[PDB]
């Protein structure tokens, strides 16, 4: 006969060392077999005929939870995605050379040590008030935990007003965080 | 090639909700497989190639840990016993009747209530500083976990001047606990 079997959370992110509770359970009222397969230490909490309460923890990288039932010799399951992540704790921008001729070219940088995962990191290049550039990593340039965004422009007249600064977003929201931002100081350019 | 594989402890007495430390080691370099069994919640602690440190915990009833490892493709193994126990912790003396007449017989009974296991409970019938009677429990007569030992004796002159009293013996030392001594309070017979 069809059963289902769930986990409480589908997916969750969590810290270095963090930790979390899964809720397993199934419509099976009997299940012969039960339990949640995890790298990590685990300890049952609490359980009932139909499901089973742990508490996983020491979260070090991403990791799988399998949940699983077996009702009358059928086995179904179900995984919770657990990924780790560290917020952009530090952004710092930098305008190269500080002292550019107008109309001539500059590089802005902005890098953000530590911070992962990092295909769910995007840097944003403003000028004032307006997005110059930005970028999401994840496909090798400084990848899985360590990030940098680059931008060329000319220099205008009116830089010598309004300031260039960066933004670091790190949206969890598809692996079951949350969205962290950090702002960098604002730097002006030194033009002439 | 043969290997070893060895528990420490190899046994021991633990009260209810109680915890203990288990190396679970072997000779074998590199084990394929290795792990400690069991049906309590276990936090593996530490390990090396060699041996794995975990922490068992809330220890209810006496219960094995099976400890083992695979060395190319051979699998050796050993249990650890653990006993759960609750030590003598009051123990009851009753003369029936209180008053008694000189030539005639009495019962002098033991009670401990709450004390397991109770095959390892051994009570004492003592008179003044002379055993009586003594016995061991775990046939039936009230056995695992709360015990009674009575014994029939003829009052004596000297009854008149002497303690009658019980001495409660829980000697874990086969179970790898130790041994607790719990004294009842002397009382006198009263005989005309
Ligand atoms: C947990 O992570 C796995 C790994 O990607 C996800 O599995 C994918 O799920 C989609 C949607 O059903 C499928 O199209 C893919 O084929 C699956 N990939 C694999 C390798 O199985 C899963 O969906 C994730 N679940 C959640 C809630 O985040
Ligand atoms: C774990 O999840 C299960 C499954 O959803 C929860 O079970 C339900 O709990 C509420 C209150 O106990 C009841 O109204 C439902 O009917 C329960 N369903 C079943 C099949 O028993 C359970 O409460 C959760 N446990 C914990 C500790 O979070
Ligand atoms: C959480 O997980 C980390 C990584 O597995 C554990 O760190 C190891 O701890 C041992 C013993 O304390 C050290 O000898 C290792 O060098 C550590 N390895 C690494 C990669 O850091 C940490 O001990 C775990 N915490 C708990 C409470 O079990
Ligand atoms: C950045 O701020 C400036 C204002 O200092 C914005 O300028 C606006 O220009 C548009 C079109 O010319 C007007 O609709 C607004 O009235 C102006 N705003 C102000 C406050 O003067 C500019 O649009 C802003 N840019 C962004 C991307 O928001
Ligand atoms: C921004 O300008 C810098 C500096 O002129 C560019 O760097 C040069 O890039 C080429 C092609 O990759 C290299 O061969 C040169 O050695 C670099 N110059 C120096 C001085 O190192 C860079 O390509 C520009 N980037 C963007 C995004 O516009
Ligand atoms: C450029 O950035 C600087 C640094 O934040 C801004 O200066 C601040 O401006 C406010 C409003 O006038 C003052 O109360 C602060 O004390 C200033 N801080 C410093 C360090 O000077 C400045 O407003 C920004 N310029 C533009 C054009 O947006
Ligand atoms: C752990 O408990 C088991 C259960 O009795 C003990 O097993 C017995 O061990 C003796 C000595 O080798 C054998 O003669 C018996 O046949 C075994 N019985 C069973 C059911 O296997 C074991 O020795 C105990 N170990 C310790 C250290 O207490
Ligand atoms: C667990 O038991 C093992 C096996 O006896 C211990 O390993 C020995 O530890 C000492 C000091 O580390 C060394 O001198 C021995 O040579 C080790 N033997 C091997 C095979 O490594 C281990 O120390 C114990 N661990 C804990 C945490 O108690
Ligand atoms: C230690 O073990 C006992 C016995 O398994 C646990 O007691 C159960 O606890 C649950 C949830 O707290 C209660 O609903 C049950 O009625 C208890 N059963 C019995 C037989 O007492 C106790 O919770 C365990 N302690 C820990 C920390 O897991
Ligand atoms: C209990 O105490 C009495 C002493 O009050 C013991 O009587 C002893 O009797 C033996 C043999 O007649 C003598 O060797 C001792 O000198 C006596 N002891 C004393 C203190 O007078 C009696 O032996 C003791 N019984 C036990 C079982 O120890
Ligand atoms: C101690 O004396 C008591 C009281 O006389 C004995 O109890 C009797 O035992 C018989 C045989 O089992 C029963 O049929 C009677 O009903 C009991 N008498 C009463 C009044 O209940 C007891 O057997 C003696 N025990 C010892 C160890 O000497
Ligand atoms: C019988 O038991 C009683 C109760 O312990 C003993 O009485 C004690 O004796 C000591 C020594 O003389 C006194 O300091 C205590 O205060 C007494 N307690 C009580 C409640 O009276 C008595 O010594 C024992 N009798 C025999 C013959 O051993």
Request: aromatic share 6%.
């Given at each position: 006969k069809v059963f289902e079997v769930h986990v409480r959370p589908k997916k969750l992110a969590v810290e270095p060392k963090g930790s979390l509770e899964v809720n397993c359970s199934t419509t099976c009222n009997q299940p012969e077999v039960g339990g949640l397969e995890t790298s990590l230490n685990k300890?049952?909490?609490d359980e009932?005929?139909?499901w089973k309460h742990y508490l996983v923890s020491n979260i070090?990288?991403?990791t799988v939870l399998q949940c699983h039932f077996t009702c009358s010799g059928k086995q179904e399951s179900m995984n919770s995605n657990v990924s780790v992540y560290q917020p952009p704790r530090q952004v710092i921008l930098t305008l190269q050379p500080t002292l550019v001729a107008v109309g001539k070219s500059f590089t802005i940088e902005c890098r953000v040590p530590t911070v992962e995962p990092?295909?769910?990191?995007?840097?944003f290049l403003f000028r004032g008030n307006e997005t110059l550039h930005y970028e999401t990593f994840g496909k090798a340039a400084p990848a899985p935990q360590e990030a940098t965004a680059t931008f060329n422009?000319?220099?205008?007249?009116?830089?010598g007003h309004r300031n260039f600064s960066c933004l670091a977003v790190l949206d969890l929201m598809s692996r079951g965080g949350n969205?962290?931002?950090?702002?960098?100081?604002?730097?002006?350019?030194?033009?002439?």
């Open positions: 300890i049952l909490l009932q005929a139909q070090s990288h991403d990092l295909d769910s990191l995007t840097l422009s000319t220099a205008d007249r009116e830089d969205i962290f931002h950090k702002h960098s100081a604002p730097k002006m350019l030194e033009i002439y």
